[model samples]
Target: HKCDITLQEIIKTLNSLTEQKTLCTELTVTDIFAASKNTTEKETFCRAATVLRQFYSHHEKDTRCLGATAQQFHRHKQLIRFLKRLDRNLWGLAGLNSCPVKEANQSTLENFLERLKTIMREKYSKCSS
Candidate 1:
C-alpha cells in the first residue's frame, strides 16, 4: 500500500538525512579506489565500496539522497539501467550501491535481478516460517 507521502517528500527526507550525516563529502573516488586496492578486510573494503557506489548511484540533479541536484534527476536510460542493476546487486546492503569487491562479478541486468530474487526469497522464507 502506498503511503500518504509522495516520492518527492521521501526524497527530501533522504536528502536531509544524507546532509545531516555529511555523507556526500566523506567519499571520494581516489579514496575509494585506493582503499579497494589496499584493504583485505571485508568490512573496510565494503564500507569504502559503499561510499563510492553511492557517489555514482546518486542522481546528481534530483535533490534527493542520491540525486542532490536538479541535473542529476533527469531521466536517462543508461543511468536508469545502471542504477537498477546496481540496486539489484546491492539488495540487502545499505544505500543505493554495494561495497566494492575484489573481483566484481560484472553482473548483467538479468544476473542482478536473479541475485535480488534469491536474496528476497531467502529473507521472505526466514520471516514466513
Candidate 2:
C-alpha cells in the first residue's frame, strides 16, 4: 500500500503531478474483500464496484489507455490478494457461493467506496484533459 511507501520512496518516484495522481488513483481501490462476509456484504461490495465501474468506464471510453480503468487494479495488490486470500472469491465465484475471506464492517466498506469515488472523479477528470 502507498501508506507503506516511505518519504524516500516518494522522492524517488516523484514525477509530474499527473503521474503522481495516476499512481494515487491506482492506490484507490486496494481491498475488494471488505464486507464480503455474507450475501449482503457481497452486494455492498458489488454495488460499490458497480458504481465505480460506471465512473471509470466513462473515463475509459475516450482514452486509448485501453484497459486503463481496470488496469489500475493490478497495482492495487490487496485487491487481487483478497481475491485469492481464502476461498478465492473471484476465482471461486464459478459456483462456490461461499468465499472464505473476512470483510470490513459495512460502514468501513461504504466509507472507502465513497472516498474512492471522489478520488476517481478527480483522477479521471484529469485524465480526460
Candidate 3:
C-alpha cells in the first residue's frame, strides 16, 4: 500500500540511467593534457546539461520515473510538485547551458544523478516500513 515498490523501481532505473553508454560517453570526455584544469564552472554545467538533454532525448525512464513516483506517492503535494518540475528543471538547466556565474570536487552527469538517487533513497526510507 506504500510507495516502496515505486521507489525501488526508481532506484533500479536510476542505476541504469547512470550507466547508460551514451550518457556516460557524453560526460566522460577525456581531459588529457590538463584540459580540465582550465575548465570553468559554466562549461562543465553546460556539458553536463548537454549530456542530460541527449539522454532524455533517447530515453523515457528519466521522465517516466518521475511520473511513476508521483503516482505512487501522490499524497505529498510538495513532493509531487518537486517531481513535476524535474523535467522542466532539466530543460531549464540544459537551456541555461551554464551556471551563469558557476563534483567529486566535478560537476558532471554522475554527480547530478547521484544527488537525485540520494533524494529518492531518502524518500524511500521515509516511506518504508
Candidate 4:
C-alpha cells in the first residue's frame, strides 16, 4: 500500500526531499495546527476544522480514500484515546476537540471521552455493520 496519501503525504515526501533526507512523516502537529495560533479564534477554528475534517468524516468508515495519502487510521475508541493521552494532565491540547474554540473541551479529555462513549451507546451505537 502507498500509505496515508492525502494532503498528508506528498507533504512528507517533499519535506524529506527538500531537506536532502528521505523520510516519512506519520503525523505532525505543525502540519495540522501550525495555523491555529496567532490568528483570530474564528480563523483558527475554521482552519483547524478544515484540516481535521477527514479525521471526523471518515471516522465511521474503516478506510480513507484521499488518493496517495489514503491510509488507515485507528477506530473511534483508539483515536479518542490517543487524543486523550495527548491532552495529558495539564496544558497542550492533543486533538481537534481540544482546539479550544469548541465547547466539547469544557471538561477534561477523559470526561469528554466518556461523553463520547455515552453518546455512542445511546445514539452513535452502530454504523454500517
The model with the greatest TM-score is 3
Clashing residue pairs in candidate 3 are 103-106
Candidate 2 displacement at residue 97 in angstroms: 11
User: TM-scores of all models?
Assistant: 0.31, 0.24, 0.35, 0.24
Q: Write the per-residue lDDT of candidate 2 for residues 19-112, one digit (tens) a residue.
A: 3233333323334445445455344434444434443444444343233565765544433233223222212322334333333433433345
The candidate 3 region of ten consecutive residues with least summed lDDT is 24-33
- C-alpha displacement of 73 in model 1, angstroms? 11
* Order of candidate numbers by TM-score, starting with the best: 3, 1, 4, 2
Error of 2 at 84 (Å): 16
Could you give candidate 3's per-residue lDDT for residues 16-111 as a string of tens digits? 545442323233322211334666434544554444444445433334324345453333333334323443443353446343222223344456
> Which segments of model 2 are wrong by more than 4 Å?
1-39, 61-129
Error of 2 at 14 (Å): 19
Q: What is the lDDT of residue 100 in candidate 4?
A: 35
Give me the runs in candidate 3 sitting further than 4 Å from their true place: 19-55, 58-106
Clashes of 2: 1
lDDT of 1 by residue, 51-94 (tens): 43554566444344343444434433345554444433334234
Greater-lDDT candidate between 2 and 3 = 3
What are the lDDT scores of the predictions, listed in order?
A: 0.39, 0.37, 0.44, 0.33
- Positional deviation of 90 in candidate 1, in angstroms? 5.9
Clashes of 3: 1
